[PDB]
Design a binder for this molecule. Structure first.
Ligand code: A1IDZ
Ligand code: DOC
Length: 540
DNA sequence: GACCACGGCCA
DNA sequence: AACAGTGGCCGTGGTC
Protein backbone atom coordinates (compact mmCIF):
# COMPACT_ATOMS: atom_id res chain seq x y z
CA UNK A 1 0.00 0.00 0.00
CA UNK A 2 3.10 2.18 0.48
CA UNK A 3 5.97 2.71 -1.93
CA UNK A 4 9.25 1.03 -0.95
CA UNK A 5 11.85 3.50 -2.13
CA UNK A 6 15.35 2.47 -1.02
CA UNK A 7 17.53 4.02 1.66
CA UNK A 8 18.59 6.83 1.92
CA UNK A 9 15.29 8.47 2.79
CA UNK A 10 14.31 12.06 2.00
CA UNK A 11 14.62 14.99 4.39
CA UNK A 12 12.09 15.74 7.12
CA UNK A 13 11.05 12.08 7.04
CA UNK A 14 9.47 10.25 9.97
CA UNK A 15 11.57 7.49 11.54
CA UNK A 16 10.51 4.02 12.63
CA UNK A 17 12.73 1.75 14.71
CA UNK A 18 12.67 -1.47 16.71
CA UNK A 19 14.68 -2.01 19.90
CA UNK A 20 15.63 -5.32 21.49
CA UNK A 21 14.44 -3.93 24.85
CA UNK A 22 12.70 -0.82 26.16
CA UNK A 23 15.90 0.78 27.54
CA UNK A 24 17.59 2.74 24.72
CA UNK A 25 20.94 2.66 26.54
CA UNK A 26 20.80 -1.14 26.71
CA UNK A 27 18.89 -1.80 23.48
CA UNK A 28 20.13 -3.45 20.30
CA UNK A 29 18.89 -1.54 17.24
CA UNK A 30 17.13 -4.32 15.32
CA UNK A 31 15.43 -2.43 12.47
CA UNK A 32 15.32 1.10 11.10
CA UNK A 33 12.96 2.73 8.63
CA UNK A 34 11.72 6.10 7.44
CA UNK A 35 8.52 7.41 5.89
CA UNK A 36 7.41 10.50 3.98
CA UNK A 37 4.72 10.98 1.38
CA UNK A 38 3.56 7.45 1.69
CA UNK A 39 6.98 6.10 0.83
CA UNK A 40 8.68 3.82 3.35
CA UNK A 41 12.47 3.40 3.26
CA UNK A 42 13.79 0.30 5.04
CA UNK A 43 17.39 0.31 6.20
CA UNK A 44 19.59 -2.58 5.04
CA UNK A 45 21.86 -2.29 8.09
CA UNK A 46 20.34 -0.34 11.01
CA UNK A 47 23.61 0.80 12.60
CA UNK A 48 25.09 1.88 9.26
CA UNK A 49 21.93 3.63 8.09
CA UNK A 50 21.55 5.38 11.45
CA UNK A 51 24.37 7.69 10.31
CA UNK A 52 22.36 8.73 7.24
CA UNK A 53 19.74 10.45 9.40
CA UNK A 54 20.11 14.09 10.42
CA UNK A 55 17.11 14.35 12.77
CA UNK A 56 15.11 11.91 14.90
CA UNK A 57 11.47 12.56 13.97
CA UNK A 58 8.56 10.32 14.93
CA UNK A 59 7.15 8.33 17.82
CA UNK A 60 9.55 8.08 20.77
CA UNK A 61 12.12 10.17 18.92
CA UNK A 62 13.94 10.78 22.21
CA UNK A 63 14.63 7.06 22.65
CA UNK A 64 16.27 6.76 19.21
CA UNK A 65 18.28 9.91 19.91
CA UNK A 66 19.54 8.31 23.13
CA UNK A 67 20.80 5.20 21.31
CA UNK A 68 22.36 7.48 18.69
CA UNK A 69 24.32 9.33 21.38
CA UNK A 70 25.27 5.89 22.74
CA UNK A 71 27.08 5.43 19.40
CA UNK A 72 28.76 8.85 19.50
CA UNK A 73 26.29 10.20 16.93
CA UNK A 74 24.54 13.54 17.16
CA UNK A 75 20.94 12.79 16.15
CA UNK A 76 18.66 15.33 17.84
CA UNK A 77 15.06 14.29 18.54
CA UNK A 78 12.53 16.48 16.75
CA UNK A 79 8.77 16.27 16.30
CA UNK A 80 7.05 13.51 18.25
CA UNK A 81 3.32 12.71 17.91
CA UNK A 82 3.44 11.42 21.50
CA UNK A 83 4.09 14.96 22.74
CA UNK A 84 1.13 16.30 20.73
CA UNK A 85 -1.25 13.68 22.13
CA UNK A 86 0.15 14.09 25.65
CA UNK A 87 -0.53 17.84 25.54
CA UNK A 88 -4.00 17.17 24.11
CA UNK A 89 -4.68 14.66 26.90
CA UNK A 90 -2.19 13.38 29.52
CA UNK A 91 -4.01 10.04 29.34
CA UNK A 92 -2.17 9.52 26.03
CA UNK A 93 0.94 7.94 27.51
CA UNK A 94 1.95 5.09 25.19
CA UNK A 95 2.18 4.57 21.42
CA UNK A 96 -0.32 1.71 21.69
CA UNK A 97 -2.96 3.85 23.40
CA UNK A 98 -2.66 6.83 21.06
CA UNK A 99 -2.88 4.43 18.11
CA UNK A 100 -6.18 2.91 19.27
CA UNK A 101 -7.63 6.40 20.06
CA UNK A 102 -6.67 8.50 17.02
CA UNK A 103 -6.18 5.83 14.36
CA UNK A 104 -3.83 3.12 13.10
CA UNK A 105 -2.13 0.13 14.70
CA UNK A 106 1.11 0.09 16.71
CA UNK A 107 3.00 -2.93 15.36
CA UNK A 108 6.48 -4.43 15.74
CA UNK A 109 7.94 -3.58 12.31
CA UNK A 110 10.11 -0.54 11.68
CA UNK A 111 8.49 0.34 8.36
CA UNK A 112 4.96 0.25 9.74
CA UNK A 113 6.11 2.25 12.77
CA UNK A 114 7.66 4.80 10.41
CA UNK A 115 4.43 5.17 8.42
CA UNK A 116 2.32 5.38 11.59
CA UNK A 117 4.46 8.22 12.97
CA UNK A 118 3.76 10.34 9.89
CA UNK A 119 0.04 9.52 9.89
CA UNK A 120 -0.35 10.22 13.61
CA UNK A 121 1.54 13.51 13.39
CA UNK A 122 -0.69 15.01 10.68
CA UNK A 123 -3.79 14.02 12.66
CA UNK A 124 -2.65 15.25 16.08
CA UNK A 125 -1.04 18.41 14.67
CA UNK A 126 -4.33 19.14 12.92
CA UNK A 127 -6.24 18.79 16.17
CA UNK A 128 -3.70 20.99 17.97
CA UNK A 129 -4.37 23.80 15.49
CA UNK A 130 -6.18 26.57 17.32
CA UNK A 131 -4.95 25.33 20.71
CA UNK A 132 -2.19 27.92 20.57
CA UNK A 133 -1.59 27.73 24.32
CA UNK A 134 -0.80 24.04 23.83
CA UNK A 135 1.24 24.78 20.69
CA UNK A 136 3.39 27.12 22.79
CA UNK A 137 4.05 24.34 25.30
CA UNK A 138 4.90 22.07 22.38
CA UNK A 139 7.19 24.45 20.48
CA UNK A 140 8.78 26.17 23.48
CA UNK A 141 8.78 23.43 26.14
CA UNK A 142 8.07 19.81 25.26
CA UNK A 143 9.76 19.42 21.86
CA UNK A 144 13.08 21.08 22.85
CA UNK A 145 13.00 19.37 26.27
CA UNK A 146 13.24 15.94 24.63
CA UNK A 147 16.67 16.88 23.25
CA UNK A 148 17.72 17.86 26.77
CA UNK A 149 16.38 14.59 28.20
CA UNK A 150 18.18 12.63 25.47
CA UNK A 151 21.52 14.02 26.64
CA UNK A 152 20.67 13.37 30.29
CA UNK A 153 19.84 9.71 29.63
CA UNK A 154 22.92 9.32 27.43
CA UNK A 155 25.34 10.99 29.86
CA UNK A 156 24.31 9.02 32.95
CA UNK A 157 25.64 9.47 36.48
CA UNK A 158 28.65 7.94 38.22
CA UNK A 159 27.98 5.61 41.15
CA UNK A 160 30.39 4.62 43.93
CA UNK A 161 30.03 0.88 43.42
CA UNK A 162 32.60 -0.29 45.97
CA UNK A 163 30.90 1.94 48.55
CA UNK A 164 27.52 0.27 47.96
CA UNK A 165 29.09 -3.20 48.00
CA UNK A 166 30.49 -2.48 51.46
CA UNK A 167 27.13 -0.96 52.44
CA UNK A 168 25.41 -4.19 51.39
CA UNK A 169 27.42 -6.37 53.77
CA UNK A 170 27.17 -3.75 56.53
CA UNK A 171 23.37 -3.86 56.36
CA UNK A 172 23.16 -7.61 55.64
CA UNK A 173 24.43 -8.27 59.17
CA UNK A 174 22.03 -5.78 60.78
CA UNK A 175 19.16 -7.49 58.95
CA UNK A 176 20.15 -10.91 60.30
CA UNK A 177 20.16 -9.53 63.86
CA UNK A 178 16.63 -8.14 63.56
CA UNK A 179 15.44 -11.20 61.63
CA UNK A 180 16.64 -13.55 64.37
CA UNK A 181 15.19 -11.33 67.10
CA UNK A 182 11.77 -11.22 65.42
CA UNK A 183 11.72 -15.03 65.31
CA UNK A 184 12.52 -15.05 69.03
CA UNK A 185 9.50 -12.86 69.79
CA UNK A 186 7.23 -14.81 67.43
CA UNK A 187 8.44 -18.09 68.95
CA UNK A 188 9.02 -19.59 65.49
CA UNK A 189 10.59 -18.59 62.16
CA UNK A 190 8.58 -17.40 59.17
CA UNK A 191 9.02 -15.25 56.05
CA UNK A 192 9.02 -11.60 57.16
CA UNK A 193 8.91 -10.52 53.49
CA UNK A 194 5.54 -12.26 53.10
CA UNK A 195 2.77 -9.94 54.28
CA UNK A 196 0.42 -12.93 54.41
CA UNK A 197 2.58 -14.83 56.92
CA UNK A 198 3.21 -11.73 59.04
CA UNK A 199 -0.58 -11.30 59.14
CA UNK A 200 -1.05 -14.64 60.93
CA UNK A 201 1.83 -14.01 63.34
CA UNK A 202 0.64 -10.55 64.41
CA UNK A 203 -3.13 -11.00 64.40
CA UNK A 204 -3.86 -14.72 65.00
CA UNK A 205 -1.01 -16.05 67.14
CA UNK A 206 -0.49 -12.77 68.97
CA UNK A 207 -3.43 -10.92 70.48
CA UNK A 208 -2.64 -7.77 68.53
CA UNK A 209 -5.72 -5.93 67.21
CA UNK A 210 -6.01 -5.40 63.46
CA UNK A 211 -6.51 -1.72 62.67
CA UNK A 212 -7.48 -1.70 58.98
CA UNK A 213 -8.07 -3.75 55.85
CA UNK A 214 -6.39 -3.82 52.45
CA UNK A 215 -8.13 -2.55 49.33
CA UNK A 216 -8.57 -5.34 46.79
CA UNK A 217 -8.81 -8.44 49.01
CA UNK A 218 -9.72 -7.10 52.46
CA UNK A 219 -6.91 -8.76 54.40
CA UNK A 220 -5.69 -7.47 57.76
CA UNK A 221 -3.13 -4.87 56.74
CA UNK A 222 0.46 -5.09 58.01
CA UNK A 223 1.39 -1.70 56.58
CA UNK A 224 3.60 0.75 58.44
CA UNK A 225 0.50 2.74 59.44
CA UNK A 226 -1.10 -0.16 61.32
CA UNK A 227 2.23 -1.08 62.91
CA UNK A 228 3.14 2.49 63.90
CA UNK A 229 -0.03 2.48 66.01
CA UNK A 230 1.00 -0.86 67.57
CA UNK A 231 4.49 0.18 68.71
CA UNK A 232 3.45 0.01 72.38
CA UNK A 233 1.14 -3.03 72.07
CA UNK A 234 3.99 -5.49 71.45
CA UNK A 235 7.80 -5.25 71.13
CA UNK A 236 7.79 -7.36 67.94
CA UNK A 237 6.34 -4.41 66.03
CA UNK A 238 9.34 -2.27 66.99
CA UNK A 239 11.75 -4.71 65.31
CA UNK A 240 9.47 -5.45 62.34
CA UNK A 241 9.49 -1.72 61.56
CA UNK A 242 13.30 -1.56 61.71
CA UNK A 243 13.34 -4.63 59.46
CA UNK A 244 11.08 -3.11 56.80
CA UNK A 245 13.33 -0.04 56.45
CA UNK A 246 16.49 -2.07 55.83
CA UNK A 247 15.08 -4.66 53.40
CA UNK A 248 13.35 -1.94 51.39
CA UNK A 249 16.54 0.08 50.98
CA UNK A 250 18.62 -3.06 50.37
CA UNK A 251 16.43 -4.88 47.83
CA UNK A 252 15.58 -1.72 45.85
CA UNK A 253 18.67 0.51 46.02
CA UNK A 254 21.87 -0.86 47.61
CA UNK A 255 21.89 -4.17 45.72
CA UNK A 256 20.15 -3.51 42.35
CA UNK A 257 21.93 -0.27 41.42
CA UNK A 258 25.60 -1.41 41.18
CA UNK A 259 24.58 -4.15 38.72
CA UNK A 260 23.09 -1.59 36.28
CA UNK A 261 26.40 0.15 35.54
CA UNK A 262 26.73 0.32 31.77
CA UNK A 263 29.89 -1.28 30.32
CA UNK A 264 30.87 1.34 27.75
CA UNK A 265 30.09 4.45 29.80
CA UNK A 266 30.84 3.13 33.29
CA UNK A 267 27.80 5.10 34.47
CA UNK A 268 24.23 4.54 35.62
CA UNK A 269 21.63 5.41 32.97
CA UNK A 270 17.99 6.15 33.71
CA UNK A 271 15.08 6.92 31.41
CA UNK A 272 13.22 10.22 31.71
CA UNK A 273 9.74 9.38 30.40
CA UNK A 274 8.22 12.57 29.02
CA UNK A 275 4.57 11.47 28.59
CA UNK A 276 3.89 9.44 31.75
CA UNK A 277 2.07 11.55 34.38
CA UNK A 278 -1.35 13.20 34.45
CA UNK A 279 -0.01 16.56 35.73
CA UNK A 280 2.87 17.13 33.31
CA UNK A 281 5.61 15.92 35.65
CA UNK A 282 8.41 13.78 34.31
CA UNK A 283 8.95 10.25 35.54
CA UNK A 284 12.12 8.17 35.78
CA UNK A 285 12.51 4.43 35.30
CA UNK A 286 14.94 1.58 34.69
CA UNK A 287 16.18 2.46 37.26
CA UNK A 288 13.99 5.16 38.81
CA UNK A 289 16.35 7.87 40.08
CA UNK A 290 13.55 10.16 41.38
CA UNK A 291 13.03 8.07 44.56
CA UNK A 292 16.54 7.67 45.98
CA UNK A 293 16.24 7.65 49.80
CA UNK A 294 17.10 10.87 51.63
CA UNK A 295 15.05 10.81 54.84
CA UNK A 296 16.38 8.03 57.10
CA UNK A 297 20.03 8.15 58.24
CA UNK A 298 20.84 4.99 56.30
CA UNK A 299 18.99 6.33 53.27
CA UNK A 300 21.19 9.41 53.19
CA UNK A 301 24.20 7.09 53.00
CA UNK A 302 22.79 5.87 49.68
CA UNK A 303 22.98 9.36 48.15
CA UNK A 304 26.67 9.45 49.10
CA UNK A 305 27.14 6.74 46.44
CA UNK A 306 26.06 9.12 43.64
CA UNK A 307 29.31 10.90 42.83
CA UNK A 308 30.84 13.12 40.18
CA UNK A 309 33.67 12.07 37.92
CA UNK A 310 37.28 12.68 38.92
CA UNK A 311 37.96 16.40 38.70
CA UNK A 312 34.23 17.19 38.61
CA UNK A 313 31.65 18.30 41.15
CA UNK A 314 27.89 17.89 41.42
CA UNK A 315 25.69 21.00 41.44
CA UNK A 316 22.24 20.55 43.00
CA UNK A 317 19.55 23.25 42.74
CA UNK A 318 16.19 22.86 44.52
CA UNK A 319 13.24 25.26 44.38
CA UNK A 320 12.14 26.46 47.80
CA UNK A 321 8.51 25.70 48.74
CA UNK A 322 7.86 25.61 45.03
CA UNK A 323 4.20 24.59 44.88
CA UNK A 324 3.36 26.91 47.77
CA UNK A 325 4.85 29.75 45.72
CA UNK A 326 2.85 28.51 42.73
CA UNK A 327 -0.33 28.59 44.81
CA UNK A 328 0.42 32.15 45.92
CA UNK A 329 0.55 33.23 42.27
CA UNK A 330 -2.51 31.20 41.24
CA UNK A 331 -4.74 32.11 44.20
CA UNK A 332 -3.59 35.72 44.37
CA UNK A 333 -3.86 35.47 48.15
CA UNK A 334 -2.43 38.70 49.54
CA UNK A 335 -1.36 37.10 52.82
CA UNK A 336 0.38 34.22 51.02
CA UNK A 337 2.15 36.46 48.50
CA UNK A 338 3.23 38.56 51.48
CA UNK A 339 4.75 35.42 53.03
CA UNK A 340 7.17 34.80 50.16
CA UNK A 341 7.64 38.53 49.61
CA UNK A 342 9.11 38.73 53.13
CA UNK A 343 11.20 35.56 52.81
CA UNK A 344 9.13 33.42 55.18
CA UNK A 345 9.47 29.63 55.30
CA UNK A 346 6.16 27.82 55.70
CA UNK A 347 7.76 24.41 56.22
CA UNK A 348 10.03 25.70 59.00
CA UNK A 349 7.08 27.40 60.71
CA UNK A 350 4.97 24.23 60.70
CA UNK A 351 7.83 22.27 62.27
CA UNK A 352 8.18 24.99 64.90
CA UNK A 353 4.53 24.33 65.80
CA UNK A 354 4.82 20.52 65.96
CA UNK A 355 7.98 20.39 68.08
CA UNK A 356 7.42 23.50 70.21
CA UNK A 357 10.76 25.04 69.23
CA UNK A 358 11.48 28.37 67.53
CA UNK A 359 12.12 28.53 63.80
CA UNK A 360 15.86 28.84 64.55
CA UNK A 361 15.92 25.55 66.51
CA UNK A 362 14.22 23.54 63.74
CA UNK A 363 16.43 20.91 62.07
CA UNK A 364 16.09 19.40 58.56
CA UNK A 365 14.45 16.18 59.79
CA UNK A 366 11.76 18.24 61.54
CA UNK A 367 11.31 20.43 58.46
CA UNK A 368 10.92 17.36 56.22
CA UNK A 369 8.18 15.91 58.41
CA UNK A 370 6.34 19.24 58.23
CA UNK A 371 6.49 19.20 54.42
CA UNK A 372 4.62 15.89 54.41
CA UNK A 373 1.95 17.46 56.61
CA UNK A 374 1.82 20.86 54.87
CA UNK A 375 1.16 19.30 51.46
CA UNK A 376 -1.15 16.64 52.90
CA UNK A 377 -3.37 19.26 54.55
CA UNK A 378 -3.21 21.47 51.45
CA UNK A 379 -4.48 18.79 49.06
CA UNK A 380 -7.34 17.62 51.26
CA UNK A 381 -6.15 15.36 54.08
CA UNK A 382 -8.93 14.57 56.55
CA UNK A 383 -8.91 15.95 60.08
CA UNK A 384 -9.26 12.39 61.40
CA UNK A 385 -6.09 11.19 59.66
CA UNK A 386 -4.15 14.35 60.56
CA UNK A 387 -4.98 13.77 64.24
CA UNK A 388 -3.50 10.27 64.09
CA UNK A 389 -0.32 11.30 62.27
CA UNK A 390 0.40 14.13 64.73
CA UNK A 391 -0.92 12.22 67.80
CA UNK A 392 -3.17 15.18 68.65
CA UNK A 393 -6.90 15.04 69.47
CA UNK A 394 -9.38 15.30 66.63
CA UNK A 395 -10.45 18.75 67.81
CA UNK A 396 -6.93 20.16 67.43
CA UNK A 397 -6.53 18.67 63.95
CA UNK A 398 -9.65 20.55 62.85
CA UNK A 399 -8.34 23.84 64.25
CA UNK A 400 -4.98 23.35 62.53
CA UNK A 401 -6.76 22.85 59.20
CA UNK A 402 -8.98 25.91 59.66
CA UNK A 403 -6.03 28.04 60.82
CA UNK A 404 -4.08 26.71 57.83
CA UNK A 405 -6.57 27.99 55.26
CA UNK A 406 -7.72 31.02 57.23
CA UNK A 407 -4.12 32.23 57.20
CA UNK A 408 -4.71 32.40 53.43
CA UNK A 409 -8.46 32.88 52.92
CA UNK A 410 -8.17 33.25 49.14
CA UNK A 411 -6.77 29.75 48.55
CA UNK A 412 -10.09 28.13 49.43
CA UNK A 413 -11.89 30.56 47.12
CA UNK A 414 -9.42 29.56 44.41
CA UNK A 415 -10.05 25.85 45.00
CA UNK A 416 -13.75 26.46 44.39
CA UNK A 417 -13.05 28.59 41.30
CA UNK A 418 -10.99 25.72 39.88
CA UNK A 419 -13.55 23.06 40.81
CA UNK A 420 -16.41 25.12 39.39
CA UNK A 421 -14.60 25.63 36.08
CA UNK A 422 -13.50 21.99 36.14
CA UNK A 423 -17.03 20.62 36.04
CA UNK A 424 -18.10 23.28 33.51
CA UNK A 425 -15.21 22.87 31.06
CA UNK A 426 -14.51 19.20 31.74
CA UNK A 427 -10.80 19.85 32.39
CA UNK A 428 -8.50 21.90 34.59
CA UNK A 429 -5.44 23.55 33.06
CA UNK A 430 -2.10 24.77 34.35
CA UNK A 431 -0.96 28.40 34.20
CA UNK A 432 0.56 27.76 30.77
CA UNK A 433 -2.46 25.87 29.38
CA UNK A 434 -1.57 22.17 29.88
CA UNK A 435 -4.89 20.43 30.57
CA UNK A 436 -5.93 17.42 32.61
CA UNK A 437 -9.36 15.91 31.98
CA UNK A 438 -11.18 15.01 35.18
CA UNK A 439 -14.73 13.93 34.28
CA UNK A 440 -15.90 12.65 37.67
CA UNK A 441 -16.35 16.11 39.21
CA UNK A 442 -20.12 15.65 38.78
CA UNK A 443 -20.30 11.98 39.80
CA UNK A 444 -23.27 11.08 42.02
CA UNK A 445 -21.26 8.96 44.48
CA UNK A 446 -19.80 11.25 47.14
CA UNK A 447 -16.56 9.25 47.40
CA UNK A 448 -15.93 9.18 43.64
CA UNK A 449 -16.73 12.87 43.19
CA UNK A 450 -14.55 13.95 46.14
CA UNK A 451 -11.65 11.83 44.85
CA UNK A 452 -11.96 13.54 41.48
CA UNK A 453 -12.05 16.88 43.31
CA UNK A 454 -8.76 16.27 45.14
CA UNK A 455 -7.16 15.29 41.83
CA UNK A 456 -8.66 18.37 40.17
CA UNK A 457 -7.25 21.25 42.23
CA UNK A 458 -3.89 19.52 42.67
CA UNK A 459 -3.07 19.40 38.95
CA UNK A 460 -2.71 23.19 38.38
CA UNK A 461 -0.35 23.63 41.34
CA UNK A 462 1.80 20.56 40.68
CA UNK A 463 1.53 20.98 36.91
CA UNK A 464 2.62 24.62 36.96
CA UNK A 465 5.57 23.60 39.14
CA UNK A 466 6.43 20.97 36.52
CA UNK A 467 6.21 23.52 33.69
CA UNK A 468 8.49 26.08 35.33
CA UNK A 469 11.05 23.31 35.79
CA UNK A 470 10.79 22.13 32.17
CA UNK A 471 11.11 25.72 30.97
CA UNK A 472 14.30 26.13 33.01
CA UNK A 473 15.74 22.85 31.70
CA UNK A 474 15.14 24.12 28.15
CA UNK A 475 16.81 27.47 28.89
CA UNK A 476 19.70 26.17 31.07
CA UNK A 477 20.96 23.28 28.91
CA UNK A 478 22.59 25.40 26.14
CA UNK A 479 24.28 27.67 28.69
CA UNK A 480 25.82 24.54 30.23
CA UNK A 481 27.36 23.26 26.99
CA UNK A 482 29.16 26.58 26.52
CA UNK A 483 30.66 26.10 30.01
CA UNK A 484 31.59 22.43 29.67
CA UNK A 485 28.95 21.32 32.18
CA UNK A 486 26.43 18.49 31.93
CA UNK A 487 22.82 18.02 32.99
CA UNK A 488 22.29 14.73 34.83
CA UNK A 489 19.10 14.31 36.91
CA UNK A 490 15.76 16.03 37.39
CA UNK A 491 13.72 15.39 40.53
CA UNK A 492 10.56 17.43 39.85
CA UNK A 493 11.80 20.65 41.48
CA UNK A 494 15.52 19.79 41.59
CA UNK A 495 18.31 19.73 39.00
CA UNK A 496 21.57 17.85 39.51
CA UNK A 497 24.39 19.17 37.32
CA UNK A 498 27.99 18.09 36.80
CA UNK A 499 30.72 20.66 36.16
CA UNK A 500 34.51 20.77 36.39
CA UNK A 501 35.74 21.69 39.86
CA UNK A 502 37.13 25.05 38.71
CA UNK A 503 33.95 26.11 36.88
CA UNK A 504 31.59 24.53 39.42
CA UNK A 505 30.98 27.72 41.40
CA UNK A 506 30.34 29.58 38.13
CA UNK A 507 27.85 26.95 36.95
CA UNK A 508 26.09 27.01 40.33
CA UNK A 509 25.55 30.77 40.17
CA UNK A 510 24.44 30.73 36.52
CA UNK A 511 21.90 27.94 36.99
CA UNK A 512 20.58 29.72 40.08
CA UNK A 513 19.73 32.88 38.14
CA UNK A 514 18.26 30.92 35.21
CA UNK A 515 15.95 28.90 37.45
CA UNK A 516 15.01 31.83 39.71
CA UNK A 517 14.10 34.02 36.74
CA UNK A 518 12.76 31.37 34.37
CA UNK A 519 9.31 33.01 34.58
CA UNK A 520 8.62 35.86 37.02
CA UNK A 521 5.54 35.47 39.21
CA UNK A 522 3.76 37.50 41.88
CA UNK A 523 6.23 35.93 44.33
CA UNK A 524 9.99 35.45 43.83
CA UNK A 525 11.18 31.93 43.08
CA UNK A 526 14.08 31.12 45.40
CA UNK A 527 16.44 28.23 44.62
CA UNK A 528 18.67 26.51 47.17
CA UNK A 529 22.02 25.56 45.60
CA UNK A 530 24.94 23.55 46.94
CA UNK A 531 28.14 22.03 45.58
CA UNK A 532 29.75 18.74 46.57
CA UNK A 533 31.58 15.67 45.32
CA UNK A 534 28.47 13.54 45.96
CA UNK A 535 24.70 14.04 45.97
CA UNK A 536 24.35 14.27 49.76
CA UNK A 537 27.12 16.87 50.09
CA UNK A 538 25.56 19.05 47.37
CA UNK A 539 22.00 19.03 48.74
CA UNK A 540 23.30 20.38 52.06
C1' DG B 1 11.57 -18.18 32.07
C1' DA B 2 7.92 -14.79 31.24
C1' DC B 3 4.04 -12.29 33.12
C1' DC B 4 0.64 -10.47 36.44
C1' DA B 5 -2.00 -8.82 40.72
C1' DC B 6 -1.53 -7.38 45.14
C1' DG B 7 0.25 -5.17 49.32
C1' DG B 8 3.78 -2.29 50.54
C1' DC B 9 7.14 1.72 50.43
C1' DC B 10 10.67 4.94 48.45
C1' DA B 11 10.87 10.01 46.66
C1' DA C 1 -6.55 2.43 57.78
C1' DA C 2 -8.07 7.06 56.76
C1' DC C 3 -10.88 13.36 52.44
C1' DA C 4 -3.65 14.63 50.46
C1' DG C 5 -1.81 14.51 45.20
C1' DT C 6 2.08 12.55 41.32
C1' DG C 7 4.96 8.62 40.22
C1' DG C 8 7.93 3.48 40.01
C1' DC C 9 10.05 -0.96 42.09
C1' DC C 10 10.21 -4.41 45.45
C1' DG C 11 8.92 -9.71 47.08
C1' DT C 12 5.16 -12.81 47.45
C1' DG C 13 1.76 -15.73 45.50
C1' DG C 14 0.09 -17.76 41.57
C1' DT C 15 -0.08 -19.08 36.19
C1' DC C 16 1.27 -20.51 31.77
O1 A1IDZ D 1 4.65 14.92 50.30
C1 A1IDZ D 1 4.89 15.67 49.36
N1 A1IDZ D 1 3.86 16.05 48.52
C2 A1IDZ D 1 3.94 16.89 47.44
O2 A1IDZ D 1 2.95 17.17 46.76
N2 A1IDZ D 1 5.19 17.39 47.17
C3 A1IDZ D 1 5.33 18.35 46.06
C4 A1IDZ D 1 5.03 19.79 46.47
C5 A1IDZ D 1 6.41 20.41 46.62
O3 A1IDZ D 1 6.36 21.80 46.34
C6 A1IDZ D 1 7.21 19.66 45.57
C7 A1IDZ D 1 8.70 19.63 45.81
O4 A1IDZ D 1 8.97 19.08 47.11
P1 A1IDZ D 1 10.31 19.48 47.88
O5 A1IDZ D 1 11.29 20.01 46.91
O6 A1IDZ D 1 10.71 18.34 48.74
O7 A1IDZ D 1 9.80 20.69 48.80
P2 A1IDZ D 1 9.39 22.21 48.50
O8 A1IDZ D 1 7.93 22.35 48.62
O9 A1IDZ D 1 10.04 22.66 47.25
O10 A1IDZ D 1 10.06 22.96 49.75
P3 A1IDZ D 1 11.79 22.85 49.76
O11 A1IDZ D 1 12.09 21.86 50.86
O12 A1IDZ D 1 12.27 22.38 48.40
O13 A1IDZ D 1 12.27 24.25 50.09
O14 A1IDZ D 1 6.68 18.32 45.60
C8 A1IDZ D 1 6.28 17.05 47.94
C9 A1IDZ D 1 6.19 16.22 49.02
C10 A1IDZ D 1 7.39 15.91 49.79
C11 A1IDZ D 1 8.71 16.15 49.47
C12 A1IDZ D 1 9.65 15.71 50.42
C13 A1IDZ D 1 9.11 15.13 51.50
SE1 A1IDZ D 1 7.28 15.06 51.45
P1 DOC E 1 12.89 13.79 48.15
O1 DOC E 1 14.34 14.30 47.73
O2 DOC E 1 12.59 14.07 49.57
O3 DOC E 1 11.85 14.51 47.12
C1 DOC E 1 12.26 14.88 45.84
C2 DOC E 1 11.03 15.10 44.94
C3 DOC E 1 10.28 16.39 45.22
C4 DOC E 1 8.80 16.01 45.19
C5 DOC E 1 8.80 14.47 45.13
N1 DOC E 1 7.97 13.87 46.22
C6 DOC E 1 8.62 13.43 47.35
C7 DOC E 1 7.93 12.87 48.39
C8 DOC E 1 6.49 12.76 48.26
N2 DOC E 1 5.75 12.20 49.28
N3 DOC E 1 5.81 13.18 47.18
C9 DOC E 1 6.52 13.76 46.12
O4 DOC E 1 5.98 14.16 45.11
O5 DOC E 1 10.14 14.02 45.21
Amino acid sequence: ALEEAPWPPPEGAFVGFVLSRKEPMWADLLALAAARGGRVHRAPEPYKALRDLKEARGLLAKDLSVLALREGLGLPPGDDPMLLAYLLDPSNTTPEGVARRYGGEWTEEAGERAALSERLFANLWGRLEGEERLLWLYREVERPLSAVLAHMEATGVRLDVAYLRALSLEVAEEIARLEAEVFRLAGHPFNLNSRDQLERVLFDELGLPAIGKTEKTGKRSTSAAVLEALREAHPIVEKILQYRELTKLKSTYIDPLPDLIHPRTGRLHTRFNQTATATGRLSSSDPNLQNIPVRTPLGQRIRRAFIAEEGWLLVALDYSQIELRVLAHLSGDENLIRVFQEGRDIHTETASWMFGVPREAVDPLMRRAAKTINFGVLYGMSAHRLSQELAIPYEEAQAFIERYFQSFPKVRAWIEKTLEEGRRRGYVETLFGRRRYVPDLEARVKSVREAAERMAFNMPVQGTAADLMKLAMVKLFPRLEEMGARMLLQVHDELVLEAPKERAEAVARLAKEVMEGVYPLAVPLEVEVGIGEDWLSAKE
